[PDB]
Amino acid sequence: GIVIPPQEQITQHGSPYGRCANKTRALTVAELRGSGDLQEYLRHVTRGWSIFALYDGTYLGVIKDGTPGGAFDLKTTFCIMTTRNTGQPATDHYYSNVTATRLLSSTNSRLCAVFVRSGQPVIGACTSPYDGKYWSMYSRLRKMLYLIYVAGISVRVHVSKEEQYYDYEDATFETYALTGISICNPGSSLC
Amino acid sequence: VPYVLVKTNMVVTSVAMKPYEVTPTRMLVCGIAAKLGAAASSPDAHVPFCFGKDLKRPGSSPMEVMLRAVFMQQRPLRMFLGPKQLTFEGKPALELIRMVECSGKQDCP
Amino acid sequence: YKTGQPAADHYYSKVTATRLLASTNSRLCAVFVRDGQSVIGACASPYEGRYRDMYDALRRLLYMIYMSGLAVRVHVSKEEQYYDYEDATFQTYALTGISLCNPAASIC
């Protein structure tokens, strides 16, 4: 199913010109229809003959669908804040034997990498040099991500599930923050 | 006013970097990208993109890391180009704000 | 050495990197070759120079174009001249930009 970021991840009114602010992402129609709370919230907040801008389309109070980027012409673009503080406990969650694919990066923001084994995504893991409590870890994980992306080695990803990013759109896999990347073969203590 | 346009299915062909003429506080890492499937008549075959870099704090930008990896691996991506223009080889070069490696037909039509 | 030349960019197309020079606390230098002949000598430094901040983004590309003999063009700033190379018939000047060459795009 399509993962829908919660209600609290939306700014009041996005920037004009079509460029959403830094650390924010454009909203597609699938995510907008994903949660009815967002539907009613934008139903009552915005009044008058107002049309906004979406990546996969627009919003009115019916919803239209268009080409990617076509509706960015109009000023007001919804921007979901990418980061949400879940409040989940600080633990280690490991997912093993996956490989990098489908990288995401933005302006003054984080670097993302979908991890996939056997054809399907497992966990979306990302690092942010600027924002986040793990900011001291990008200057250490960028090298590992580059190596395991150029060589495409089966690698295990250890994430901490405090923060929840939403940089990818229509992303079935959940996006989290990554702490330890390990090049390992099955049956090892350093795994 | 250039509204941000979503460019789909480019491959970064050339990587070129320069000093920024505005301030001594920013690098200009840029490139030339080419769409696949379109004719060479349109400027869609040599579309130039630029992005700055903070030279006060040492290290590498995550977006620069992506540009290196993708350009080496010659892989498709989707950019959000606009609305700032920077000089490059005497011609305008738009600034990209975020770049997403494509998954399939649905992601990058 | 500050030559006093009026701080203009210089375009050197279709060159490849050879003959890296470096010292302990000083700048690194590279000769650039086209069709077997030397064209320009460009150097970068993280310790002294107008473009001292330039050095990390420069070394990120110089290493690549030295490992891979890719098509490269050099933008040189001629304010500062260097004499590191012994008996250098080619002029050695400061390095301000490295641009990978795409003949298909015909930019370089």
């Epitope: 920037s15 004009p16 602010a21 830094n22 650390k23 003054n108 600027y130 | 505005v22 301030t23 001594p24 506080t25 920013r26 700055g52 903070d54 700032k84 600034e95 | 701080a7 107008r50």
Partner: antibody, heavy 122, light 104 residues
Framework: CQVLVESGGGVVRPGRSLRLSCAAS????????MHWVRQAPGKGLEWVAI????????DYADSVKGRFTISRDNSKNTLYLDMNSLRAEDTAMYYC???????????????WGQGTLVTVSS | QMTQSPSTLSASIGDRVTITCRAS??????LAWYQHKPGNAPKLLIY???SLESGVPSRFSGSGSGTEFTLTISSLQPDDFASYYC?????????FGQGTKVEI
């Protein structure tokens, strides 16, 4: 056109907090880096505070570190400078300045404000 | 430090005026020349030591010979009566000038 109105200046005893507000109209308030600069009576202008177009980096001059906190807000199109532990030196005419290069990181300013007086004395 | 000269000067309507600003270390072409109306908001006049902002009369000109910079007003309409500041944007801190007054 671009405008920049200042507000919130007055006599403040040493060791008290104050808020200087900047309002702008006709353009996005903080799609541009915005700086705070003051002039002492009969002296040279100096630079104090910087704000990016999102709030990522906020550096301060060596004389306002640890006693000045800078702030932005795009909902109300407001720039805020908060003074705490005001000293006798900062008896100055303060105002804010928008950068011209757009989208961050220029240290030359295009549109400034009419200026507001903030005086520190017994 | 980044110091102007002269401190004050006078010139009638239709004359030319020259102001020099010097620095302890080289600033290359990272100069901004500002006009300071006493009792108003400064408006930018010269950028990059040579260029001109939009909407500015062309009489202003700048020369950027390295350490020593010059700003010349070719013809002085009464509007040019203000202070003038030289500013670097190369290295910390972003020092401004001390001002130079223009009157009759």
């Amino acid at each position: 056109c671009q405008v920049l109105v200042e507000s919130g200046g007055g006599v403040v005893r040493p060791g008290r907090s104050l808020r200087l507000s900047c309002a702008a109209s006709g353009f996005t308030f903080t799609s541009y880096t915005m700086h705070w600069v003051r002039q002492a009576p009969g002296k040279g202008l100096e630079w104090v505070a910087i704000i990016w177009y999102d709030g990522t980096n906020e550096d301060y001059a060596d004389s306002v570190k640890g006693r000045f906190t800078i702030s932005r807000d795009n909902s109300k199109n407001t720039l805020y400078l908060d003074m705490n532990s005001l000293r006798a030196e900062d008896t100055a005419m303060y105002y804010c300045a928008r950068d011209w290069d757009n989208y961050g990181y220029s240290y030359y300013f295009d549109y400034w404000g009419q200026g507001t007086l903030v005086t520190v004395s017994s | 430090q980044m110091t102007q000269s002269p401190s004050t000067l006078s010139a009638s309507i239709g004359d030319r005026v020259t102001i020099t600003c010097r620095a302890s270390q080289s600033i290359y072409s990272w100069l901004a020349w500002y006009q300071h109306k006493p009792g108003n908001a400064p408006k930018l006049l010269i950028y990059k030591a040579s260029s001109l902002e939009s909407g500015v009369p062309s009489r202003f000109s700048g020369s950027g010979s390295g350490t020593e910079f010059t700003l010349t007003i070719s013809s002085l309409q009464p509007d040019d009566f203000a202070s003038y500041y030289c500013q670097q944007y190369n290295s910390y801190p972003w020092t401004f000038g001390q001002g130079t007054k223009v009157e009759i």
